[PDB]
């Protein structure tokens, strides 16, 4: 569901991703998602415009917008957060990637 954070049921560097696909665009079995990385892993030389820092509880994460990808419903686990309150930043990050500034 759009702006929800879910777990990634797959052996990977990423454990979490955010569903960023419109809720009205229903691609049976697949959702487009941006992976999360522990904000600690990156310095702040890295654009927040492109790579938004979001929080889940007290922990900070970086949205790897550029490493985005659609995934199978089968690797999508439990919802651990809702980021609808960052729709602006998220939307700006995605647009920055396709249409520049």
């Amino acid at each position: 569901m759009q702006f929800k954070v879910y777990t990634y049921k797959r052996e990977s560097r990423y454990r979490l991703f955010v569903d960023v696909q419109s809720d009205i665009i229903d691609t049976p079995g697949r959702r487009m998602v941006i992976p999360l990385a522990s904000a600690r892993l990156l310095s702040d030389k890295v654009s927040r415009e492109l790579y938004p820092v979001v929080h889940i509880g007290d922990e900070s994460w970086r949205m790897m917008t550029t490493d985005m990808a659609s995934v199978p419903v089968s690797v999508i686990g439990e919802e651990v957060a809702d980021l609808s309150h960052r729709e602006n930043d998220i939307k700006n990050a995605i647009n920055l990637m396709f249409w520049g500034i």
């Binding site: 665009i25 049976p28 079995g29 659609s70 995934v71």
Partner: protein, 33 residues
Amino acid sequence: RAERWKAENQEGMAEVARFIEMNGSFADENRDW
């Protein structure tokens, strides 16, 4: 209207899903994480 587009498109969306499930997803394919 957003609902209508979703209802209108239901037939079309499954066919890409099917076409992609049969042909193959450009996604499970080139994704590295």
